[PDB]
Amino acid sequence: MGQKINPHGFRLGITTEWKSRWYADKQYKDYVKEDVAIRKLLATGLERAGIADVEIERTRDRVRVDIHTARPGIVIGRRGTEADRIRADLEKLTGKQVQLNILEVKNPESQAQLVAQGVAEQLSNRVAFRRAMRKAIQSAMRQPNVKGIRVQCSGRLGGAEMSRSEFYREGRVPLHTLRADIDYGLYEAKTTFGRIGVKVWIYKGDIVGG
Amino acid sequence: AKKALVHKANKKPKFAVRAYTRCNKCGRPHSVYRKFGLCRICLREMAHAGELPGVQKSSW
Amino acid sequence: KIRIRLKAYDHEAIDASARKIVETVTRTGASVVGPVPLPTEKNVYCVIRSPHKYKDSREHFEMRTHKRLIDILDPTPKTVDALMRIDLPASVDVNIQ
Amino acid sequence: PIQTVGRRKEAVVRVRLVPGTGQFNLDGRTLENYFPNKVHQQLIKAPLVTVDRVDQFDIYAHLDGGGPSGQAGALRLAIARALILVQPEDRPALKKAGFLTRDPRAIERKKYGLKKARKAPQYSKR
Amino acid sequence: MPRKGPAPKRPLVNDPVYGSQLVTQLVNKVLLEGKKSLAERIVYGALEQAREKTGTDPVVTLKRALDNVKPALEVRSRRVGGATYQVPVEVRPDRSTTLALRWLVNFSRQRREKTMVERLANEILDASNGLGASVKRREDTHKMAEANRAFAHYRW
Amino acid sequence: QRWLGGMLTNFSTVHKRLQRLKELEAMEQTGGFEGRTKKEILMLTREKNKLERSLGGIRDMQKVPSAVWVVDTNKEHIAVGEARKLGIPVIA
RNA sequence: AGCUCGUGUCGUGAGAUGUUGGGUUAAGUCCCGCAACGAGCGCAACCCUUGUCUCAUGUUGCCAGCACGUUAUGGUGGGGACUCGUGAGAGACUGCCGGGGUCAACUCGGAGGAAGGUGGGGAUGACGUCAAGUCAUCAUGCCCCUUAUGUCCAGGGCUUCACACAUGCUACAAUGGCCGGUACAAAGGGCUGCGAUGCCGUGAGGUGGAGCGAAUCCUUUCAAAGCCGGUCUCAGUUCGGAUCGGGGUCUGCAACUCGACCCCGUGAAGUCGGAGUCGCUAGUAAUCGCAGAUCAGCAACGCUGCGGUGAAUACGUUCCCG
Ligand SMILES: [Mg+2]
Ligand SMILES: [Mg+2]
Ligand SMILES: [Mg+2]
Ligand SMILES: [Mg+2]
Structure with a gap:
């Protein structure tokens, strides 16, 4: 809706980190190719399982993936049926092995991406988007080491035709302040009528992080 | 745009007249700009991720 | 003049490279130089994303490329080898002037 | 020995004030070979013209960066600082002319989408 | 500055070979986008020619010409009550000197002679003698001010 | 105050x-x-x-008097308006 | 610089207060008040570059004091007291005084100071209008094509043209043109790329290699405007360079339709431009060139950064537009 710049995309080298931290001469192309291929492969699985961030690093001809799952148990089921299955799928789709190592998050309500995934799933489950956003804000403000939140679900809300963008906020969510350490989440929900956008902001605290 | 065609068109081709782009990421022979040797999709993906050598979009 | 007109892709990367160079040369025990103040520039990147009618929201989004320099004099082959043995970051595309 | 520093937009200079005969030995070039514009001569003499010590003190400067006018201003600032450190009583005689301080006026950072700094593109009405 | 207050006058040092703030201002005005030394040499040659022609002090002759061509009244245009009036207002010394120097340099560039040095020398000589384009423009401005004097009662 | x-x-x-x-x-x-x-x-x-x-006023009268002496009606725009809406008697 | 919100207060109700009156700035920044109390999106600061100094260290920069050297260069040892490109700290916080101002915010002057009253300049683009730009970055509900509108190939086109509009370069001449001799700037393009000395060339350049994942190498131990000497004698010309013909070059297999560059001749418009209109408040305009984004080969005079030399005005908001 607005022209506000992505805080993560702006502070990718000041406050926030990078999801792809590697370097290669003439091979960065193939590196990012394999990265986006793995991302597209894990999209459906880790979305049905709950995903926050997929940090991929490149080593001497091998890979180092770190996926931040929210609900462990769906993707990690029986040892040799789901995890090893997806590992073998990634390996046979790429030209190398995969030493997959999952890392569990500390609080799903504290991560912006997870809150966006949850609110989008709620909206797609044929529920009141207003109540869904309210409960998500309550969960994310129930003292998860946070100080502010701002949730927005744009697009064709309620399966209507008008692009209603409900602006819901709570606490302190400054965008012009650099010393914010604000987490951002951008999600695209698919419905039977079209697409919907979910923009979330979680101002955890005023930590410098220098 | 498969591995065989990519390997056949990247090295010395049979006839010199075959000097098309033959991108390395997607492999499509056309619809790719030789300015960067990449198809628009991955080109802009890397541009937004901050990986391609110097491509960006609106700020003014 | 000499040493140097180079360029890097990341401020963190280039400052870490300068720091590790200073550390390795000081561990070899040779010497240091006198830094001087000089700013950086803004690279040339105003590329479009689509050949369509995107001529609103068009110009650019600056790619911050901060660069630092460290001058040196009185060559010594030992320092030459200690500096040319390896480069930890390898992402700073140094160019000789 | 006493030594000071002078700075400019993109230039630096280091001098060592000592007594003797007035001269300016630059880095490999002499006074007339380094200041051919005939205005930079007067500019760098102004610090030594307000107080008549042109042919009384020496100037052995070493500079780097900038152009003719920048080097002239840097050498003037260096001579001003040297006179401040040597003869405090003559400090007002140099401050009255607009010396002893580096002019904050310098080259700014050019803006984007424009031709030059503080210059919008020309466009005709429609 | 604009709508804030006046500007601080540059404490420029007097010219070393002439020592005249008016001469330095004329040099800064005739300066052609960075041609500092060139303009200095041009004005020096013009003053030397004027000296060789007259036989007196170049600075004194230039000051006399400036005082003789100084416009004592410059017309303006102000809308008061939905009606334009060209009311003449008292000009200041600095503004009058600047306008005089502007007219002088303009008429010197307009003069058709061999070189710019000779053009400026002849312009200065004509301004000092009282028969020149600068003096003609000064007289025209004075006549316009005397004709428009009918409307001067505001002093706003 | x-x-x-x-x-x-x-x-x-x-x-x-x-x-x-x-x-x-x-x-x-x-x-x-x-x-x-x-x-x-x-x-x-x-x-x-x-x-x-x-x-300093409500502790002495407690009888809704019928006279008011106002000052600085420029800044006391609400006061003069209330006075005019509660009665013509006003000394400004 | 405004946009607002929870409660309260009045009105049957749309709605009124908060945002209404003053001091002052850039601010809805503050305070006096003010049936309102607090907060959010805002502003400033937080962030980046420059300006002064200090510490941890004195690198293929500098050489001051010592020496070793011959010119195309601190080229070679020894030297922190010299500009602190890596980290931090100090320094601007109206810090203090006076005229003030409601002795509340805030204004001017002065002392130290590099900057004195958000230091000079940017990143930082709120709720929303233009049913704003994008289904050819990508996804995208719906319709449509499928022996096709999917895909390749050889040629042509997007570069065509009797015209009009927009943005830039060349200039229109003596602050000039040509020839010879001369000084400092920051910024790097480099691995199938840069490429110095030489051979010969009017010149692109045919020979080519010391040297490079980063100061031994071009972009020179760095240019143009800038300074000295000779000439042109103020004119459609030694100004201007386009069309055109002849002699060639850089790339790649392929340059009239299909780049650029060099040598010779050819020598047109242009004599600073009407009606209208654009940009500029100090390192700004002006003027000069350097470098780069992609290319094996350029339409690149364009777009971005850089600095060389660097001006005049600032009664004032009556007035054209917001
Ligand atoms: Mg009611
Ligand atoms: Mg209101
Ligand atoms: Mg439309
Ligand atoms: Mg003529």
């Missing part, structure tokens, strides 16, 4: 505050100072000071 622009239009809360302040001032005669929490005593003291500073 501060003129309340509600004394003559919203006298409900004004009279409530007046009665509360009168009750507090009357209880102060008893001597129940140290028998209360420190934070509450401080809040009291502060409110009583603010009142005593901003209240």
Whole structure:
């Protein structure tokens, strides 16, 4: 809706980190190719399982993936049926092995991406988007080491035709302040009528992080 | 745009007249700009991720 | 003049490279130089994303490329080898002037 | 020995004030070979013209960066600082002319989408 | 500055070979986008020619010409009550000197002679003698001010 | 200090505050100072000071007089308006 | 610089207060008040570059004091007291005084100071209008094509043209043109790319290699405007360079339709431009060139950064537009 710049995309080298931290001469192309291929492969699985961030690093001809799952148990089921299955799928789709190592998050309500995934799933489950956003804000403000939140679900809300963008906020969510350490989440929900956008902001605290 | 065609068109081709782009990421022979040797999709993906050598979009 | 007109892709990367160079040369025990103040520039990147009618929201989004320099004099082959043995970051595309 | 520093937009200079005969030995070039514009001569003499010590003190400067006018201003600032450190009583005689301080006026950072700094593109009405 | 207050006058040092703030201002005005030394040499040659022609002090002759061509009244245009009036207002010394120097340099560039040095020398000589384009423009401005004097009662 | 622009239009809360302040001032005669929490005593003291500073008219008349002497009608625009809406008599 | 919100207060109700009156700035920044109390999106600061100094260290920069050297260069040892490109700290916080101002915010002057009253300049783009730009970055509900509108190939086109509009370069001449001799700037393009000395060339350049994942190498131990000497004698010309013909070059297999560059001749418009209109407040305009984004080969005079030399005005908001 607005022209506000992505805080993560702006502070990718000041406050926030990078999801792809590697370097290669003439091979960065193939590196990012394999990265986006793995991302597209894990999209459906880790979305049905709950995903926050997929940090991929490149080593001497091998890979180092770190996926931040929210609900462990769906993707990690029986040892040799789901995890090893997806590992073998990634390996046979790429030209190398995969030493997959999952890392569990500390609080799903504290991560912006997870809150966006949850609110989008709620909206797609044929529920009141207003109540869904309210409960998500309550969960994310129930003292998860946070100080502010701002949730927005744009697009064709309620399966209507008008692009209603409900602006819901709570606490302190400054965008012009650099010393914010604000987490951002951008999600695209698919419905039977079209697409919907979910923009979330979680101002955890005023930590410098220098 | 498969591995065989990519390997056949990247090295010395049979006839010199075959000097098309033959991108390395997607492999499509056309619809790719030789300015960067990449198809628009991955080109802009890397541009937004901050990986391609110097491509960006609106700020003014 | 000499040493140097180079360029890097990341401020963190280039400052870490300068720091590790200073550390390795000081561990070899040779010497240091006198830094001087000089700013950086803004690279040339105003590329479009689509050949369509995107001529609103068009110009650019600056790619911050901060660069630092460290001058040196009185060559010594030992320092030459200690500096040319390896480069930890390898992402700073140094160019000789 | 006493030594000071002078700075400019993109230039630096280091001098060592000592007594003797007035001269300016630059880095490999002499006074007339380094200041051919005939205005930079007067500019760098102004610090030594307000107080008549042109042919009384020496100037052995070493500079780097900038152009003719920048080097002239840097050498003037260096001579001003040297006179401040040597003869405090003559400090007002140099401050009255607009010396002893580096002019904050310098080259700014050019803006984007424009031709030059503080210059919008020309466009005709429609 | 604009709508804030006046500007601080540059404490420029007097010219070393002439020592005249008016001469330095004329040099800064005739300066052609960075041609500092060139303009200095041009004005020096013009003053030397004027000296060789007259036989007196170049600075004194230039000051006399400036005082003789100084416009004592410059017309303006102000809308008061939905009606334009060209009311003449008292000009200041600095503004009058600047306008005089502007007219002088303009008429010197307009003069058709061999070189710019000779053009400026002849312009200065004509301004000092009282028969020149600068003096003609000064007289025209004075006549316009005397004709428009009918409307001067505001002093706003 | 501060003129309340509600004394003559919203006298409900004004009279409530007046009665509360009168009750507090009357209880102060008893001597129940140290028998209360420190934070509450401080809040009291502060409110009583603010009142005593901003209240000098409602403690004497209590009879809605029919005359007012106003000053500086430029800044006291609400006061002159209330006076005109509650009666023509006003000396400005 | 405004946009707002929870409660309260008045009105049957749309709605009124908060945002209404003053001091002052860039601010709805503050305070006096003010039936309102607090907060959010805002502003400033937080962030980046420059300006002064200090510490941890004195690198293929500098050489002051010592020496070793011959010119195309601190080229080679020894030297922190010299500009602190890596980290931090100090320094601007109206810090203090006076005229003030409501002795509340805030204004001017002065002392130290590099900057004195958000230091000079940017990143930082709120709720929303233009049913704003994008279904050819990508996804995208719906319709449509499928022996096709999917895909390749050889040629042509997007570069065409009797015209009009927009943005830039060349200039229109003596602050000039040509020839010879001369000084400092920051910024790097480099691995199938840069490429110095030489051979011969009017010149692109045919020979080519010391040297480079980063100061031994071009972009020179760095240019143009800038300074000295000779000439042109103020004119459609030694100004201007386009069309055109002849002699060639850089790339790649392929340059009239299909780049650029060099040598010779050819020598047109242009004599600073009407009606209208654009940009500029100090390192700004002006003027000069350097470098780069992609290319094996360029339409690149364009777009971005850089600095060389560097001006005049600032009664004032009556007035054109917001
Ligand atoms: Mg009601
Ligand atoms: Mg209102
Ligand atoms: Mg439309
Ligand atoms: Mg003529």
